[PDB]
Ligand binder design. Structure first.
Ligand code: PEE
Ligand code: PEE
Ligand code: HEM
Ligand code: HEM
Ligand code: IKR
Ligand code: BOG
Ligand code: BOG
Ligand code: ZN
Lengths: 146, 101, 48, 61, 380
């Protein structure tokens, strides 16, 4: 906002049986793509380096509400169950999940993000008037130090 | 008296920009005139001209060329810009001589 | 006429060694990075 | 698995990386010179004063 | 104003937008490395230049001895010296490749960037010329005299220009000293212009081997070209060091190991290879004035090049005819060089006049003509 970086952006953690895609996606004008990306890859980094207990406490309380939210109605419950079993084997209760969340702390995050983010070759999908995103190489280097 | 044609065709293969998949008129240096003509090109013809070049560059950077079967052929080269060009040069040549009057 | 003579040749040696090794290394890194481009592939897929 | 182990303890954090180059270089110097000097001298056996010194150092007058 | 800190900093915005985020074609070749090399080259000469200057004594009675002392007494003095004298060559080599490149790819269509270039060359040339006199050896001395003495061919306004330039009636101390000052100065002036050179360039971006809009596919200078550049550096620095560390004087004539003596003239007076081609043209015309002009124009001609482009295409890549004419020219310089390292006796002389005669002829008539003719074969 301070810089009008984009239009929208989102963090996603798609999970598949044996794999998954962790990242983000933003939409933006042809001339702010760069600054935006830059900042994004940046934040990502900060994750592995200087994440605070304030950031997590907040993230947890957010996640909690978000999980609870997925179970607002009947349709959204069967979905979860249809899934939970099929994917996880058992079925995880908000009580279980929650505790699994209350257990996380700053230190824990920096370690996991580091594990799957830091110095890793990423996948990139650019679509549209992207003349400013350019060079995987650069994009690659944005995967370390911050 | 096919002397000429024989030559033009020779030189054509001599310069060999086909090897890159270019068209005579792709290689045209973008002076003010050319600059103008290109702007007039119908979306498609222009968008095509583009790729061809972006393709050619990627080759040159790679230090490769197109496989012999894909090169362009003297008679299949489409002078897509010449017409647009000539006119520009005609239009300008007019203006110019009229500002002397 | 050139007392250095010796030390200068002793240097030439050292210089040739470092040189050769450091050029090799750089050449890798140059290629490495550039790979991204030389390996690149493009297609022209209009809407037709 | 040196490449692995290396990428982990060494080339990972841009800090330990640098720290390696430093120390690493130290070793390199300390031992590159030896080799070089040694090689050079060998190619000049008995021509250098380092060799023909014994002939005047404490053996004359 | 901005997020990161190299676009909102009135300084890093100049160390960035000129060497890191700089839009570069993706297909420029090795003939584009000479740019940075030329720079790096300067960065070095100046440095070794000072380091020497800190031990030199500009005086017709100490110049030689100082340089000598510099070599025999100063720590790594000899090394520092070699590097400088050889840095000179390395400098020219890089410049000539740089220039050739520009000619073979019509980079000279970048008018300003070009003209600044030419000047830069001129300055570099003058610069060496003075630096050569400093060691005050036979060649140092005589090269001075032979050249400076040309000026006296100009009518009226010259017979004076010379005695003014010498600070006396012949090349002597008054000269040495002022030359030293000049040699200290010019390098900086080069660095200066070089800045302007790179600016006029960044006004259009690099020309690419194909000679067609690069906008369709440009890459960031870093790491692509920064990396390429450094490799290029090493691939040169090697022979530069290799010759300067194993064959020091391979290039430099010996008569310059003999303290200058205005009373006796060396058997043969001939410059360093990079001035040979010119020397040869100067000596082709028998008439101080004419030869002078030929020398001048032999290098000044460059300015014309732009106005002598007739092809509808830019680079010679797709113009076979021009290409050979181009190589005929290059070889034409080699010859002139050689002819310059030889005396003034048959056959040399005749070969001499021809070579020079063909040198101008090419850049003046062939190139522009074969260009036109070329165009018509494309049917344009
Ligand atoms: C006693 C001797 C010991 C003392 C040594 C003193 C010198 C100290 C130097 C500190 C070491 C520097 C550390 C750099 C680390 C930065 C880095 O990331 O690597 C460099 C980085 C590469 O990026 P990545 O491979 O992606 O690495 C990512 C890491 N996860 O950038 C580079 O390309 C630079 C490295 C190449 C250098 C090339 C230079 C060639 C020049 C040689 C000419 C010879 C010397 C003459 C000098 C003339 C001076 C007047
Ligand atoms: C003036 C002083 C002259 C003194 C002599 C200088 C030293 C002479 C050394 C000999 C040079 C030989 C170099 C061999 C290069 C051979 C070569 O690569 O030729 C082919 C190749 C074809 O290129 P493309 O058509 O774009 O390819 C398409 C993609 N595959 O040619 C090139 O690389 C481009 C030519 C650039 C090299 C020019 C260097 C010659 C230097 C002389 C200076 C001349 C300029 C005028 C100076 C005025 C003062
Ligand atoms: C004083 C020394 C000079 C320095 C340090 C210098 C440096 C550079 C640099 C850094 C570049 C950009 C990269 C490249 O080389 O393509 C460049 C480009 C250029 N220089 Fe020079 N230059 C010098 C001399 C000259 C000379 C004497 C000429 C010729 C009269 C000249 C003509 C050009 C041209 C035409 C370009 C355009 C390059 C292109 O085609 O993309 N320069 N120069
Ligand atoms: C434009 C870059 C430079 C060029 C092309 C250049 C070239 C030369 C040349 C041609 C010589 C004769 C070398 C020999 O004896 O074989 C020389 C000598 C010298 N130069 Fe430079 N020089 C440059 C920069 C400098 C600078 C910047 C200084 C210091 C301000 C400097 C100081 C000297 C000194 C002290 C000598 C005389 C002693 C010697 O010959 O070693 N030079 N230079
Ligand atoms: C002081 O004399 N320096 C000389 C030299 O080669 O310095 C590097 C030198 C030595 C012997 C004969 C002629 C010269 C200078 O000759 C020059 C100098 C310049 C500038 C140009 I254009 C063209 C020629 C032919
Ligand atoms: C050849 O040997 C050289 O001798 C010099 C002194 O003579 C030393 O300063 C150098 O380090 C040494 O390599
Ligand atoms: C391309 C870059 C090459 C750099 C090579 C570094 C060579 C400098 O090596 C030198 O050798 C001398 C002779 O033993 C020693 O006396 C010096 O102390 C040493 O620094
Ligand atoms: Zn001689």
């Amino acid at each position: 906002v301070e810089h009008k970086l984009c239009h929208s952006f989102q963090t996603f953690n798609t999970s598949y049986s044996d794999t998954g895609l962790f990242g983000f996606h933003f939409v933006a004008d042809p001339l702010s793509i760069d600054d935006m990306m830059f900042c994004a890859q940046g934040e990502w980094m900060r994750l592995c380096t200087s994440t605070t207990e304030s950031e997590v406490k907040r993230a947890k309380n957010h996640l909690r509400s978000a999980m609870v939210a997925q179970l607002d109605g009947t349709t959204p419950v069967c979905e979860t169950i249809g899934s939970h079993l099929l994917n996880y084997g058992r079925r995880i209760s908000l009580e279980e999940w929650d505790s699994r969340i209350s257990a996380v702390d700053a230190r824990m995050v920096r370690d996991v993000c580091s594990k799957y983010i830091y110095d890793k070759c990423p996948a990139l999908a650019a679509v549209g008037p992207i003349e400013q995103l350019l060079d995987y190489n650069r994009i690659r280097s944005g995967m370390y130090w911050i | 008296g096919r002397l000429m044609d024989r030559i033009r065709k020779w030189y054509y293969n001599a310069a060999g920009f086909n090897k890159y998949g270019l068209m005579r008129d792709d290689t045209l240096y973008e002076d003010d005139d050319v600059k103008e003509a290109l702007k007039r090109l119908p979306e498609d013809l222009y968008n095509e001209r583009m790729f061809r070049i972006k393709r050619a560059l990627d080759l040159s950077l790679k230090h490769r060329i197109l496989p012999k079967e894909q090169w362009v052929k003297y008679e299949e080269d489409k002078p897509y810009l010449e017409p647009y060009l000539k006119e520009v040069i005609r239009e300008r040549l007019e203006r110019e001589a009229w500002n002397k009057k | 006429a050139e007392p250095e003579h010796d030390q200068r040749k002793r240097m030439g040696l050292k210089m040739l060694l470092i040189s050769a090794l450091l050029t090799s290394l750089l050449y890798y890194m140059k290629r490495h990075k550039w790979s991204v481009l030389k390996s690149r592939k493009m297609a022209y897929r209009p809407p037709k | 698995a040196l490449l692995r182990q290396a990428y982990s303890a060494l080339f990972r954090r841009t800090s330990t990386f640098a720290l390696t180059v430093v120390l690493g270089a130290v070793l390199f110097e300390r031992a590159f010179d030896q080799g070089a000097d040694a090689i050079f001298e060998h190619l000049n056996e008995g021509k250098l004063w380092k060799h023909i010194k014994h002939k005047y150092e404490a053996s004359e007058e | 104003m901005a997020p990161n800190i190299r676009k909102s900093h009135p300084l890093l915005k100049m160390i960035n937008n000129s060497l890191i985020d700089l839009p570069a074609p993706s297909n420029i070749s090795a003939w584009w490395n000479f740019g940075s090399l030329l720079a790096v080259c300067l960065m070095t000469q100046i440095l070794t230049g000072l380091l020497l200057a800190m031990h030199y004594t500009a005086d017709t009675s100490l110049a030689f001895s100082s340089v000598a002392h510099t070599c025999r007494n100063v720590q790594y003095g000899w090394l520092i010296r070699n590097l400088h004298a050889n840095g000179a060559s390395f400098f020219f080599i890089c410049i000539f490749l740089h220039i050739g490149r520009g000619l073979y790819y019509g980079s000279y269509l970048y008018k300003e960037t070009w003209n600044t270039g030419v000047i830069l060359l001129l300055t570099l040339m003058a610069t060496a010329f003075v630096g050569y006199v400093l060691p005050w050896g036979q060649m140092s001395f005589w090269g001075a005299t032979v050249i400076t003495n040309l000026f006296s061919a100009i009518p009226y306004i010259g017979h004076t220009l010379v005695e003014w330039a010498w600070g006396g009636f012949s090349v002597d101390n008054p000269t040495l000293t002022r030359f030293f000052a000049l040699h200290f100065l010019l390098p900086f002036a080069i660095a200066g212009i070089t800045i302007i050179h790179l600016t006029f360039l960044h006004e259009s971006g690099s020309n690419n081997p194909l000679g067609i809009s690069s906008d369709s596919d440009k890459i960031p200078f870093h790491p692509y070209y920064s990396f390429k550049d450094i490799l290029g550096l090493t691939l040169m620095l090697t022979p530069f060091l290799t010759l300067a560390l194993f064959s020091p004087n391979l290039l430099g004539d010996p008569e310059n190991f003999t303290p200058a003596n205005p009373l006796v003239t060396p058997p043969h007076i001939k410059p360093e290879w990079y001035f040979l081609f010119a020397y040869a043209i100067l000596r082709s015309i028998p008439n101080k004035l004419g030869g002078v002009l030929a020398l001048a124009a032999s290098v000044l001609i460059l300015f014309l090049i732009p106005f002598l482009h007739k092809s509808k295409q830019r680079t010679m890549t797709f113009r076979p005819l021009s290409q050979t004419l181009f190589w005929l020219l290059v070889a034409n310089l080699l010859i002139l060089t050689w002819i310059g390292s030889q005396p003034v006796e048959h056959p040399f002389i005749i070969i001499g006049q021809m070579a020079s005669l063909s040198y101008f002829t090419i850049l003046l008539i062939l190139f522009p003509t074969i260009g036109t003719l070329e165009n018509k074969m494309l049917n344009y």
